[PDB]
């Protein structure tokens, strides 16, 4: 039997519309000894709502059960721990995972929005290009838009470590060449904590 | 049931670079006190191939001595997809562990290199962002260095390719050189070394 717990999504825990949940996930469950114990601790301290879901059967012939602790927005933000502690009758001792916010002081994003190189526009398609650098931790959402309306055709890259030990990425949005020199408003979205209101935008224009 | 294999491939420069050295390597883990005896066999597309060098025991802490097995390729073999073989074989495990790899497969398809000055908002801080845009490559294996008058440059740091929706990958670079540098007019150059492209390498360079 092997624990896995896993963190909220970005975004959910900068919108207060949203729910950030923590989802604590135990396999290789026997048949043989099928129960499964949570107790859920937020900083150490024992907390009582988390909601299990029934033990569901795999293929393999193991349980998986997951259980899902809702976490408040500012706690999480506030650097709290959350640990999971899974009890079971196959087990030693029982196992416990604890996971966080990546700890160090938050750093705002710098969002730069960048244009093609002279040198693409012979394509048929052009790289639209949003770097955001200088942030910490590297939990980041990006998007990017243009007259109000969600562009779909971009794609992110993964948060790199700085040598100042801030995080940096690049999306790439990928348009049509005509679009471009319509044309044309473009605007790349950015929700982190050390932003105001969580979000920030920079358009793009020829 | 004891220990347990991972089975890293060469360093894209070194095999691009007939000069460098390019190595297929086997690192081991969890290693036995009690039969702590290790062998290595390896294969390249089935035939076995005795001119690899087994590295003496490491240490560890926490306990268990690693084992590694380092085999030296042609370039052109690892190029053309041959298959590498680190057959394993401990006492203590119940039949001899086997890893295989090799480049990946499919047509390899040329980057296009471009070069992307800083953002005007940049331009008031004491440092600057010199950004080299590769997109459109295939394999994901690709060396990336930035160098100004000849001269390498320290401080850039390089993304991990991306997966596009072409089936291709991407990646960004970003050089940060301080303002007065890039102020003063400077050359800088972004090089990408790759498989399809003419000698394994283009440069393309940025300034004002
Ligand atoms: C039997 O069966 C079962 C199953 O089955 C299945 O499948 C297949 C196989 C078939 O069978 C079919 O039929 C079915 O389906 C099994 O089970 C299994 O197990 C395993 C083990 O073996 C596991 O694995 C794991 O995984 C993970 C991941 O996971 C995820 O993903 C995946 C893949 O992709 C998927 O699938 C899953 O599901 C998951 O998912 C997730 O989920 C979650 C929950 O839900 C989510 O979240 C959520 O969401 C929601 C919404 O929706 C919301 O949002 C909330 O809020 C949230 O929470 C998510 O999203 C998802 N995702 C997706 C979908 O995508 C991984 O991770 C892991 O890995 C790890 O570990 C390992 C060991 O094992 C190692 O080696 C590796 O390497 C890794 O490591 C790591 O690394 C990392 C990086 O960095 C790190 O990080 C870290 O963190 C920490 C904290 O803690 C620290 O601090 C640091 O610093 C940092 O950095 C980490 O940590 C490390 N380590 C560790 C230890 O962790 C693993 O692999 C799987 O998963 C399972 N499955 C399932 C399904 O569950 C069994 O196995 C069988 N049997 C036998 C006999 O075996
Ligand atoms: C007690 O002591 C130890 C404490 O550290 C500890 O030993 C560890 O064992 C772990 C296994 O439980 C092991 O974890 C693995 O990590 C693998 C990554 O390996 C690199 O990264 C590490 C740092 O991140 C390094 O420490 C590793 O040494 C290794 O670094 C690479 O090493 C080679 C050296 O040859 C090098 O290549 C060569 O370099 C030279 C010159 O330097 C030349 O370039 C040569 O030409 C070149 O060949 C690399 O450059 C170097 N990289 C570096 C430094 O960054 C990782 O492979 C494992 O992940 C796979 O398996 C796990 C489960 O086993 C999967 O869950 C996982 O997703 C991965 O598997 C995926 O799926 C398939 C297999 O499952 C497979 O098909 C795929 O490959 C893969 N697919 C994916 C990911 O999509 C695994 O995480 C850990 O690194 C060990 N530590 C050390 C120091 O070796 C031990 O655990 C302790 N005892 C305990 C806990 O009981």
């Excluded at 207060?16 to 043989?32: G, L, N």
């Excluded at 996971?99 to 710098?110: D, F, L, M, V, W």
Aim: proline share 8%; glycine share 4%; net charge neutral.
């Amino acid at each position: 039997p092997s624990v896995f717990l896993f963190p909220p999504k970005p975004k959910d825990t900068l919108m207060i519309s949203r729910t950030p949940e923590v989802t604590c996930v135990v396999v290789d469950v026997s048949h043989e000894d099928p129960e499964v114990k949570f107790n859920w601790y937020v900083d150490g301290v024992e907390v009582h709502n988390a909601k299990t879901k029934p033990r569901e059967e795999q293929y393999n012939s193991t349980y998986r059960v997951v259980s899902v602790l809702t976490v408040l927005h500012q706690d999480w933000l506030n650097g709290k721990e959350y640990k999971c502690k899974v009890s079971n009758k196959a087990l030693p001792a029982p196992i416990e995972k604890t996971i966080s916010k990546a700890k160090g002081q938050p750093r705002e994003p710098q969002v730069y929005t960048l244009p093609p190189s002279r040198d693409e526009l012979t394509k048929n398609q052009v790289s639209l290009t949003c770097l955001v650098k200088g942030f910490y931790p590297s939990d980041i959402a990006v998007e990017w838009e243009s007259n109000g309306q969600p562009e779909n055709n971009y794609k992110t890259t993964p948060p790199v470590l700085d040598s100042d030990g801030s995080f940096f990425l690049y999306s790439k949005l990928t348009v049509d060449k005509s679009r471009w020199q319509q044309g044309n408003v473009f605007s790349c979205s950015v929700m982190h904590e050390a932003l105001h209101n969580h979000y920030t935008q920079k358009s793009l224009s020829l």
